[PDB]
Symmetry: D2
Subunit: 255 residues, 4 copies
């Protein structure tokens, strides 16, 4: 189904990114992995699927490090057919305590890296007259939360960016869309659970409450489910999906 294609998923070392990479590997795509931490588990999980993978540790804060990432993709697999711009970080604090460099570093990773990713993958997709660009935004690309100045700004930014690219690619076989998940139980969310449990004391309760306050299904979204959505978007049935931000969020945006 994706046999012949090369997907690059940024921040695929854990979480959502690793789940999406796994689902694309299962569909037959060769895989360029990226992110910090030990790359071994991710590479192991991908190789189970019978598909080739490499990993580059590029810090996407750093535009030159993004360029080296894409160039390893060029050299190892010939180019990127599917780019999933997923790598992202979170920092919680009132707007007037919001650390100036967390502001900077969230805009860097969560927004600018998405543009740099796009600008580097897009010429080869247009040349090859097929491509998919999927940006992992968030419900926070559509609405705010308290404490999330930087991330909401960045995510909104991605949603808008998605529109521009989806529009500029419209007359080609390249599409660009965003997936806006609600809560997924990854390290990035566990951190928030831990912080909420810090005073008081039940991590399981803090978990429920985190979820209950925003997410009426009371159930987390799974990386696999988001990987299957990406796969959807990569099919022919996604050919006229362009510039869209599709939420998978257990009701978060419905209210």
């Amino acid at each position: 189904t994706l046999k012949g294609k090369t997907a690059l998923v940024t921040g695929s070392t854990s979480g959502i990114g690793l789940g999406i990479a796994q689902v694309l590997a299962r569909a037959g795509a060769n895989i360029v992995l990226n992110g910090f931490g030990d790359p071994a588990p991710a590479l192991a999980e991908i190789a189970r699927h019978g598909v080739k993978a490499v990993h580059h540790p590029a810090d996407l804060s750093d535009v030159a490090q993004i360029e080296a990432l894409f160039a390893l993709a060029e050299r190892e697999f010939g180019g990127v057919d599917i780019l999933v711009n997923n790598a992202g970080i979170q920092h919680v604090a009132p707007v007037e305590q919001f650390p100036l460099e967390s502001w900077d570093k969230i805009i860097a990773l969560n927004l600018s890296a998405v543009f740099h990713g796009t600008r580097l993958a897009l010429p080869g997709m247009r040349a090859r007259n097929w491509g998919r660009i999927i940006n992992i935004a968030s419900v926070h690309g559509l609405v705010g939360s308290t404490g999330k100045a930087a991330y909401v700004a960045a995510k909104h930014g991605v949603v808008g960016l998605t529109k521009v690219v989806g529009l500029e690619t419209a007359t080609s076989n390249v599409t660009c869309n965003a997936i806006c998940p609600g809560w997924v139980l990854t390290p990035l969310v566990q951190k928030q659970i831990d912080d909420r449990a810090a005073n008081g004391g039940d991590p399981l309760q803090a978990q429920h409450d985190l979820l209950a306050e925003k997410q009426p299904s009371l159930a987390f979204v799974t990386p696999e489910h988001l990987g299957e959505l990406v796969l959807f978007l990569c099919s022919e049935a996604g050919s006229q999906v362009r510039g869209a931000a599709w939420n998978v969020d257990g009701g978060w945006l419905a209210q």
Copy 2:
């Protein structure tokens, strides 16, 4: 995949609903077809996928004929697991010259049929702890165009109603969502095109340019495959959403 599930698609004797019912039949759902006209073609298109199908000709602005249509599904299949509220009716006029017969029918078929189909389907989906309600709304559930007062109101209402049902069923394995298509290649839109003694592609361009940046049609089959996706487990936490497939229509 959908073996053992019953799907009811309204407006499915031709065009969109037919295209969607076909994808669900191929996935292994039994089908309740519905609509005006000779039901023979659509029933034959479904049967060759090795699935059972029946048809009811319910006029969807008549509550009774809707209740008749659901009684059929009940009495053939035990009820509906997958409900696709799909309705074809458009009328174009400036609002002050918009005929009242047209406003009422458009509201009845495009909006109120969705509430009736829903209230009739949902007790069964809850009891069975699994259901999918998928509402085929439109880009015009999210923006306006000139001359389309009734249509835009109805489709916007569907997108709102989707969110209520979506929230109401959120703690269950029943979900409700809307798909919001731009220009879709229908038999009627095709007619409009081959209306040309001499180049059908430029016809298509001229049609789509204003609203649809891709200059290319969404197909009934692209829509069927998204229905199908919404019905997979990867659809489980898609709730109260309104997903556009529109060639870029809503991106500008």
Copy 3:
């Protein structure tokens, strides 16, 4: 600033209706009032402003009675310059337990009436080269809540209709917009109700919007500065749509 203009405000015997009516009448507009319950309190309040107050009790779920409300405006005044489509009800029930007549009634009042008002007022506004049609929709014309199948559908419809009319009138001096309030403290809210409980879940400011706020925004849309606000749906809501 609206002297010698006529405003017809639906559902203006009471509440948001009456408070919008007051602001317009204060600004100098003659007022056609509407609704149930007894209009003398309303008529004395709008006339306290020294502007002609005239009332019709039409049930707007009835098309013929909407036309008789307008016929009055036409005969007292030579027609409507400002249309405020405000009349609205509510029923709370889960969709599968939602009464069929409540669904039909909420659709007719909360949506169809707005179109009927619109199609009745607009020709006179085009002909006289100036008009405002302002729809009181709701937060629920942008997001849903549980129990509000009919209401959410009707107010989303109003928001979409507003777009169509906003676009159709975009090359004239007539504009058409919606205001989308959150919780206002009114009998039809105090129904739902202490109050910092009903507010807490939905409205982060934990404070009510007032009909006077809403009336002032109406005046703003009626002014020269609303001249290029068209087909918009502007929320007044304590943060409800921000999250």
Copy 4:
């Protein structure tokens, strides 16, 4: 209306910010002007109204200069009651040709500056138990256009940011909202028109995006901000109100 108040408008030596300043001065607000060029026709346009105006030329892509802007407001006025984040820069190119310094700079001025003005203005607004923060975003906070990657990302970022701050202040007498204009008749735009029948050129220009074929004016915008500033704006929180001649309706 605003006698006793201080309004800081960024990008106010012409165009939109100046229109907005003039409307706030007419209402009685003291006025801190910011922006490039000669400040004199602007400082005198506000003096017409009998309020105090000071100008600071800060480059809002430089955080140190944003902070000196707020320091100056502090010293001359005791702080900002009304903050209007208006300054905006633009560059048009397809995404894959989008110049990297142009991406950085658009994000800096049209997005990051809004963060910085906010975090500086808000402590004082809170302390005094009253404030308004109004971000002039764009319809490009809500939709995209071709060629505008950076401008659209930034203005979206503004609209999201505005939601967050309108939520974090929701239980206070500080509100934060966005105004999203379509095409505004600004000196750059006026020179676009001049270069192209003035009225045909206007219509040829607005036809695609703005149904009314007519401009939003700086004046109209000023009057909205004044409205956001009244008591009837008190429960408007985290909103993005479009003024666009029908741009977002379609």
